[PDB]
Amino acid sequence: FEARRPKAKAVISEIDGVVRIEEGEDRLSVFVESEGFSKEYKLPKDARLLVKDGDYVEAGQPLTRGAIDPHQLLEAKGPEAVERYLVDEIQKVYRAQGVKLHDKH
Amino acid sequence: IVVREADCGTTNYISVPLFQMDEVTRTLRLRKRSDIESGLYGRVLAREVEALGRRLEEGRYLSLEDVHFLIKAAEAGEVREVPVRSPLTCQTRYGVCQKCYGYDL
Numbered sequence: 001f002e003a004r005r006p007k008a009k010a011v012i013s014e015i016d017g018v019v020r021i022e023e024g025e026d027r028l029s030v031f032v033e034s035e036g037f038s039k040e041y042k043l044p045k046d047a048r049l050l051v052k053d054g055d056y057v058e059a060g061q062p063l064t065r066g067a068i069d070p071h072q073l074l075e076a077k078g079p080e081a082v083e084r085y086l087v088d089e090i091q092k093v094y095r096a097q098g099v100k101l102h103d104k105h
Numbered sequence: 106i107v108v109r110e111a112d113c114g115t116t117n118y119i120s121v122p123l124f125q126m127d128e129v130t131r132t133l134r135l136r137k138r139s140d141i142e143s144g145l146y147g148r149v150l151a152r153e154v155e156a157l158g159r160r161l162e163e164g165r166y167l168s169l170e171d172v173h174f175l176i177k178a179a180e181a182g183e184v185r186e187v188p189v190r191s192p193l194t195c196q197t198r199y200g201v202c203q204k205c206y207g208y209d210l
């Protein structure tokens with residue numbers, strides 16, 4: 001509800017494109033490449049990812065496992081994507097505690 | 106935020122999923138029947154839905170029976186999302202309207 005930046009934060013793609021993982025050891029990078037862009041996300045080697053070599057990710061989709069910065073999601077995928085993400089992540093917590101409230105609220 | 110109008114005159118909506126995706130867990134399972142209730146009970150469909158030899162008109166307040174029916178049509182393989190009028194897409198300024206908001210729970 002305060003839209004804060006998580007600590008163990010996931011990295012998301014800002015563009016649509018295909019995934020290309022390049023790792024010479026001690027460093028790791030995930031490339032999201034398209035006809036118009038080839039952007040490299042260099043990640044800490046310890047961090048675990050969600051994308052196979054050759055996957056098609058859309059803009060805003062997370063590349064790693066953590067929580068998503070709602071401001072980074074705002075820029076990449078727009079406001080309605082942040083709304084749905086916040087609701088789902090909020091409703092996750094109450095569901096893990098057995099509390100049932102409607103999504104409207 | 107107060108219910109100010111009977112209808113704000115919008116065609117927008119949100120698609121509430123009926124299936125979840127977990128990485129390492131291939132394919133998409135049904136969402137828990139309670140979570141779907143929290144996402145569908147009382148809400149207004151924005152587009153007409155046809156499934157299991159039956160049709161749900163547009164603008165119908167979804168009773169819990171309709172939610173159970175929509176879950177049956179889901180596990181039959183006939184519906185995967187439900188178009189719904191939600192406050193996220195409501196055009197009522199400084200409030201919501203009677204149809205973008207659903208039941209008085």
Ligand SMILES: [Zn+2]
Nearest residue numbers: 113195202205
């Ligand atoms: Zn409205």
